[PDB]
Amino acid sequence: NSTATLCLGHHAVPNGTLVKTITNDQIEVTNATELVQSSSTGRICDSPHRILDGKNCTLIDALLGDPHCDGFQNEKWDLFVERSKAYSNCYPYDVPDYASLRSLVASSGTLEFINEDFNWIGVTQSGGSCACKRGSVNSFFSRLNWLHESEQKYPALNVTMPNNGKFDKLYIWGVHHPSTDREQTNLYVRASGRVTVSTKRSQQTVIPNIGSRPWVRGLSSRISIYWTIVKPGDILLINSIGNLIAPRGYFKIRTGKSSIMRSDAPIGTCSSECITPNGSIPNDKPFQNVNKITYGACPRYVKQNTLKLATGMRNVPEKAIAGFIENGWEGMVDGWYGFRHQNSEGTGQAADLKSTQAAIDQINGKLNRLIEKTNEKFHQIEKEFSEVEGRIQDLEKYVEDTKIDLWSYNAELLVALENQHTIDLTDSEMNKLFEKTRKQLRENAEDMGNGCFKIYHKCDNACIGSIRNGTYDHDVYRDEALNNRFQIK
Amino acid sequence: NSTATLCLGHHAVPNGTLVKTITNDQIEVTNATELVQSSSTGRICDSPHRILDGKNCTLIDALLGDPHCDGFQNKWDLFVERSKAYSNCYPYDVPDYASLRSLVASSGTLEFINEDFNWIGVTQSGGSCACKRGSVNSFFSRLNWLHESEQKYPALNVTMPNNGKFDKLYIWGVHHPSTDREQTNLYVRASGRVTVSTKRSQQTVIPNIGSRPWVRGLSSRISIYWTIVKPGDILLINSIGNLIAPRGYFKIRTGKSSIMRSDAPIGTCSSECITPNGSIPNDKPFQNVNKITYGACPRYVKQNTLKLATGMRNVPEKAIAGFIENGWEGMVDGWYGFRHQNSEGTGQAADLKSTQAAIDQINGKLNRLIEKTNEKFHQIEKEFSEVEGRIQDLEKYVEDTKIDLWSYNAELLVALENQHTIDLTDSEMNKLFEKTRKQLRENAEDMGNGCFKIYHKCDNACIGSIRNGTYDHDVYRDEALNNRFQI
Amino acid sequence: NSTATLCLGHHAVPNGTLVKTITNDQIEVTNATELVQSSSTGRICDSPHRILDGKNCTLIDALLGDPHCDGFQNEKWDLFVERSKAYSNCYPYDVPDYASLRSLVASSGTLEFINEDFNWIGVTQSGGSCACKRGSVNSFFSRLNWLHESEQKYPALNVTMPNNGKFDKLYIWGVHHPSTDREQTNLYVRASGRVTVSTKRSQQTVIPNIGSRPWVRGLSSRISIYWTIVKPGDILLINSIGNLIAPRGYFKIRTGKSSIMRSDAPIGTCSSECITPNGSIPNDKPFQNVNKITYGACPRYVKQNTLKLATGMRNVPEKAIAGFIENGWEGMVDGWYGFRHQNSEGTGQAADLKSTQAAIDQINGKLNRLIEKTNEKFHQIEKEFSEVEGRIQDLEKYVEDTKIDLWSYNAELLVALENQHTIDLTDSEMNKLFEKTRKQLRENAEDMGNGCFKIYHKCDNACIGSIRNGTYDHDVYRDEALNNRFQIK
Ligand SMILES: *[C@@H]1O[C@H](CO)[C@@H](O[C@@H]2O[C@H](CO)[C@@H](O[C@@H]3O[C@H](CO)[C@@H](O)[C@H](O)[C@@H]3O)[C@H](O)[C@H]2NC(C)=O)[C@H](O)[C@H]1NC(C)=O
Ligand SMILES: *[C@@H]1O[C@H](CO)[C@@H](O[C@@H]2O[C@H](CO)[C@@H](O[C@@H]3O[C@H](CO)[C@@H](O)[C@H](O)[C@@H]3O)[C@H](O)[C@H]2NC(C)=O)[C@H](O)[C@H]1NC(C)=O
Ligand SMILES: *[C@@H]1O[C@H](CO)[C@@H](O[C@@H]2O[C@H](CO)[C@@H](O[C@@H]3O[C@H](CO)[C@@H](O)[C@H](O)[C@@H]3O)[C@H](O)[C@H]2NC(C)=O)[C@H](O)[C@H]1NC(C)=O
Ligand SMILES: *[C@@H]1O[C@H](CO)[C@@H](O)[C@H](O)[C@H]1NC(C)=O
Ligand SMILES: *[C@@H]1O[C@H](CO)[C@@H](O)[C@H](O)[C@H]1NC(C)=O
Ligand SMILES: *[C@@H]1O[C@H](CO)[C@@H](O)[C@H](O)[C@H]1NC(C)=O
Ligand SMILES: *[C@@H]1O[C@H](CO)[C@@H](O)[C@H](O)[C@H]1NC(C)=O
Ligand SMILES: *[C@@H]1O[C@H](CO)[C@@H](O)[C@H](O)[C@H]1NC(C)=O
Ligand SMILES: *[C@@H]1O[C@H](CO)[C@@H](O)[C@H](O)[C@H]1NC(C)=O
Ligand SMILES: *[C@@H]1O[C@H](CO)[C@@H](O)[C@H](O)[C@H]1NC(C)=O
Ligand SMILES: *[C@@H]1O[C@H](CO)[C@@H](O)[C@H](O)[C@H]1NC(C)=O
Ligand SMILES: *[C@@H]1O[C@H](CO)[C@@H](O)[C@H](O)[C@H]1NC(C)=O
Ligand SMILES: *[C@@H]1O[C@H](CO)[C@@H](O)[C@H](O)[C@H]1NC(C)=O
Ligand SMILES: *[C@@H]1O[C@H](CO)[C@@H](O)[C@H](O)[C@H]1NC(C)=O
Ligand SMILES: *[C@@H]1O[C@H](CO)[C@@H](O)[C@H](O)[C@H]1NC(C)=O
């Protein structure tokens, strides 16, 4: 009757979520957000990166000039997308260190080809084959020049091509491996052919190997592909007594942010900074679980499929009025912290805006820092493999597996530390509001232990409102309160 | 006389341990646990992984068919190579020996299937005195040394299609004679070629004739090569001479198998983690036994010890006194408790709830430190017996980078865990003290040393009500207010 | 008049600095230190590591014996410093796997060469060339032996060199590639040549390739360099039909902490444990941003150029006397925490030494724990590249980029956690001093809410000093204080 009760409390929800800390792996909070991107639209957005769909063409086949890949001449790309349906339909070939050539062309990001006037004296040029038709006529790789004898003669070829410019040149050349000895001599006169391509700083000599190889598109012969980069001021010198597959020029080789990716995802008209073989994914989350192969500004790949970041306080279900001691207020929806009172004029409830904003601001602060930083990668290493290789592939897999486990640990520890700090900061906001009310009341109230104060004087609605507003004057009620406290009963 | 003292305190031990945080590298706690496994039984447990002891045989020698390795014909989870292993057949080398050893070890089987290669016009199964099998000239069991017949060596051209649904691993070789007389007495022609190709690959090797140092009586050598044939693909072997032919193929699989160099004996026990020093337990999150591991293992760090605090901050004990700069070495039945003095004497009782609240949080931190498994199988090599250069430099650098990053994680993790353990145990002491204050209301006063001066007659049943949490302050309020605010 | 005010407070400065935590990326503190070393003297200190300046000589040219590199015979080093001005001035050559040979010689850290008496029967030794002048007369690599025909004969060379010692031997040998067929026969009689160098465990056979290569210092011919290590008990056997560039002995190969570094920084007479291509840097900070290429005891390379570690409390600008509640004391310069009072004899201010030392000791403790040594590296991988290589180079760059991003994250998280703990420990020292004063005053004072106490009795200078010293006896003033508190006004 002659007293009033003022209780301090915090909100609670009927649909909490479980998050993790260092101590507890299952603590319930009022709200949480997902830090692992796990879904993808399924399509590769054509912005902001220049996407080049290879369709039926590998990058190497477009480089060499497979007739069905003619549409890729002089193309440029930020990301070349190789399809699993791609195929070769020209002269059967292999590339020693196929992965390295594919990688350096993918990183260069252009197929800009410049024809140079190589003068091959005494030999027939542009040899054709039935296994490489262009317009239903025998043909060959567009960027290579199959040379063979003329008038039953094959004079030693010795041709120089100096780089008098200011950019590097990429030369693609080959060596022809016949099937039989009659084939070797009908094409190159001599029974053994040498091919030597050298600069001032390097030399490469290849000896053809004659022998029956399994039929591929009707042919038992093969061609081995090689490459050579000529620096400005350096000179390209090509020397051959036979089996030379000559270049028709050079490719402009650049240094850029371009790469290549194996994917069957369709190309879509959208904008997304991050691309995976599953399609583009958003980068609003710090981590992702779609694919370890990424291109562009991406979240970091982790092994966990979900990592829940607490964005509210610990959810304590609700138990006269009572305070926050082992009791949450599911009826308080307009704020995270508030006051419940009971006086002579009834009861009421009001939220505290400052302490509510103080907790939201700290959580929005962790979010802005969790969604920050730079993981924008371009050409990296390969991470899936279709053949068994051994040592080099063992090291490539180990590096990536080591990397993923280290970032999985970082993500796991980061969320647990963030959640514990979120729990502590929200618990401190409740304590700071309780202690601020204690200091206002001075000797006019007593801590009841359950988060409520027993105010030892008649405190009407204007009096309760002054405590909530922070304008409570304890000298006004001190004499009345001291009498109610220290009275004999 | 008319008052009583009630003190809050925590336990203390006479044998504390020193742990580290970020501020203090040497803070004493009541108890600690070791997070780094440093010891090993010394033996490799034969469970749960299928262990294959190589004894005197390397994996490559068992693959090719060294006569003293015949017992390895046709599986393993881990092949254990001994340092006492030796070769006792035809002297040989393997270009990219490490990769072939790796892919066979990863496949985890030596299942060999004979195929009927028909070699027309040549003599098969050539033997040598440097590869005796039963005291007779012999050769690698899985290879077929071909040479001339009737002073003729017609060009070999043999196809072997893969009409099945699994991959085939073919192991073949090329023979390098010592002199020209040897080259022609065996292969007629003065030079030779071996070409093994599929639809997607080709390998051509030219023999090299020349004197090489004597090894088991022979100056000649054999270079070993391999080729994988996919289903639908075709193996084609073309040779002018010096061909060491395969007798079939090895079934190549994709599994969790690996290989390890170790001299540790095999034991009849069960252990998920194997190191070259022997199996180690995986009850701790980190280990310092060996960076080479197989199975579900703790992560390798450089530190030999990392102590995780499992008890509160140890304060030696200095009338009764509270917890302020004072621990209670006499309290053995609990971590926190009450000491009182009234008209009926003194007493001490522990608080079970706060004691369990601190133990549960420490058991909670423990659980989470033995959860996220590190189960690796075939990896990279981490020790090397020859100088190689660029590739070996990268392999060492990768492993050294990894160990330094996990060593930092382990160092930071324990320091953060210990600081939180110190803070949570300090908060349990403060919460019990604040819980007691709220019960006493205006019937007591904080003496500053963790004790309360209770300003009323509080007998044993009254002290017990404070400890149980059923203390009624209205009963003693009038008496207490008279003792507090008296002149 | 009959009362006194005692305020608890902390210091503040007019020149605060901004540090980062997990919540706030911009919190102002009174003092901070830089954890990233970003500057360098620009010179390489010649202590404590033995520095060998290569000047005009690459390590490979000093190994082979380029005449202008004669001053490097039998040299030793902890770090070989290659200058960009280096050049070759002998027979034009190439090294298959040049990077691996350069690496293993650099790691061995010595060029100690021991001449061995190879007996080459029937051939002329020490062939010279105009492209390798030594003292203005035709010469050759000092450590190699160019063999050619004698009396128009080149009998098959078959020479053994057993390792009868207890250390490994490093043999450097070569193969000569002529330009024309007449050159091949004028020097080696036969039209082709084989070179086979083998031990009991390895064999290497090289076939020369005849052909025109671009002119380098007047010559179209080349020499390919190879190496072989012979273990104790093993035997070196050299078999050659022609074109052999023979060794004159072996290099002692060691296992040490030596390495090689490309740098143009000048050598200086100073002492520094850490060396970068930019020069020596101090290792007083845990992280550095000068160069990812390091040698010796170094800070760890990160991407951030600055990381400020808070070394003081949160700086709160100063707003009767008032306490620490939303108020710092810029007038307190002799301590971090202190007392401000007002009694009948005036006002005063005094610092608290114990709480000030308790906060400084914890901060000095964190500083020391950040300089514990785990990064002393020597020979590592290469991290810059002047040519395009592909797969192996991609993996080398990816490994280093993976490493830097992981340590950059560690540094970022470490400083944010350290700063938050420093803020928490400095705030706790302020609260503990306030609660310590509360316990002394008992019922003789009341918490005013702003960090000050209202002392309800006459408390002169000797009485205030007892509270500051910790020897305040509340029983002396209890009766006087109770009458002032619970009086009717
Ligand atoms: C060395 O042996 C191989 C394998 O026995 C021989 O290759 C085979 O050559 C025949 C043609 O002479 C190929 O047959 C053709 O097959 C196609 C489609 O299968 C068919 O349309 C043609 O009418 C013809 O039958 C056969 O594919 C091919 N086998 C392989 C695996 O490529 C090779 O000719 C022999 N070489 C010498 C020099 O003896
Ligand atoms: C080229 O020179 C090498 C080096 O001398 C010759 O190899 C050597 O060949 C002899 C052949 O009689 C080997 O001798 C044998 O040594 C064993 C082992 O102790 C001994 O028990 C035998 O009774 C015999 O004396 C010698 O070991 C071997 N040395 C090496 C390093 O392999 C080779 O014969 C020469 N070839 C030509 C074409 O000149
Ligand atoms: C194959 O073609 C190359 C390219 O023409 C020939 O090499 C060239 O040979 C000439 C004459 O030996 C070199 O000329 C010399 O050039 C220097 C300038 O550095 C000049 O001062 C000399 O007086 C002389 O003119 C020319 O530099 C050289 N070119 C290159 C790129 O190396 C080679 O001779 C041909 N081989 C055959 C077998 O025909
Ligand atoms: C809980 O329910 C409310 C009401 O629809 C909803 O707005 C909120 O996002 C839910 N959140 C969770 C994580 O359950
Ligand atoms: C719940 O948390 C997420 C993460 O911050 C936030 O996006 C959302 O607005 C929050 N919801 C509530 C119910 O206010
Ligand atoms: C790709 O190949 C398919 C099937 O051969 C053909 O229908 C299609 O036109 C090709 N696409 C292009 C762009 O050439
Ligand atoms: C993403 O794609 C890869 C195969 O392209 C697959 O292994 C993975 O499970 C996919 N998952 C999601 C969520 O996209
Ligand atoms: C302290 O001694 C007890 C009793 O012998 C023992 O059980 C306990 O494990 C010891 N603890 C430490 C940290 O030494
Ligand atoms: C290799 O195994 C055989 C067969 O037991 C044995 O006699 C020989 O001495 C072994 N070598 C060892 C065990 O060092
Ligand atoms: C185990 O590993 C190697 C040899 O296996 C060597 O360092 C030592 O003998 C052992 N060290 C440890 C820590 O067990
Ligand atoms: C000390 O800690 C360990 C692990 O937390 C526990 O197994 C052990 O029994 C503890 N000892 C005591 C006396 O608490
Ligand atoms: C602030 O100014 C003083 C006065 O020169 C100086 O000693 C101190 O280092 C400065 N601190 C900061 C953080 O600027
Ligand atoms: C390096 O070569 C240049 C040019 O010939 C010469 O002037 C200089 O003195 C040389 N330096 C040394 C240290 O021999
Ligand atoms: C260190 O050297 C490299 C190469 O000159 C340069 O890119 C980098 O900016 C330099 N940084 C400093 C701080 O000297
Ligand atoms: C500022 O911090 C540094 C690092 O702790 C310390 O050396 C210096 O004494 C501090 N300066 C002041 C004015 O306290």
Side-chain angles (χ1 to χ4, degrees), chain C residues 227-247:
Chain C
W227 74 90
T228 300
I229 295 177
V230 183
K231 306 288 296 186
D234 207 334
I235 304 174
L236 184 73
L237 185 45
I238 298 179
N239 188 21
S240 176
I241 303 303
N243 309 66
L244 166 65
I245 310 295

Side-chain angles (χ1 to χ4, degrees), chain B residues 38-40 261 275-277 288-290 300 383:
Chain B
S38 57
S39 57
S40 177
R261 303 179 180 94
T275 75
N277 309 77
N288 190 236
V289 183
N290 202 311
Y300 182 79
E383 295 175 354

Side-chain angles (χ1 to χ4, degrees), chain C residues 200-216:
Chain C
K200 291 174 182 177
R201 55 165 302 274
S202 64
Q203 56 172 346
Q204 297 166 267
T205 294
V206 186
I207 312 293
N209 314 116
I210 308 163
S212 296
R213 297 145 177 104
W215 264 35
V216 173

Side-chain angles (χ1 to χ4, degrees), chain A residues 94 213 391 394 398 446, chain B residues 102 202 388 399 402 477:
Chain A
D94 65 84
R213 297 146 177 105
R391 184 173 189 172
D394 291 337
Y398 189 79
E446 293 185 14
Chain B
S102 174
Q202 56 172 346
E388 287 177 296
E399 184 65 18
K402 169 184 177 182
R477 185 177 176 97

Side-chain angles (χ1 to χ4, degrees), chain C residues 15 17 30-31:
Chain C
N15 58 325
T17 322
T30 67
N31 196 25

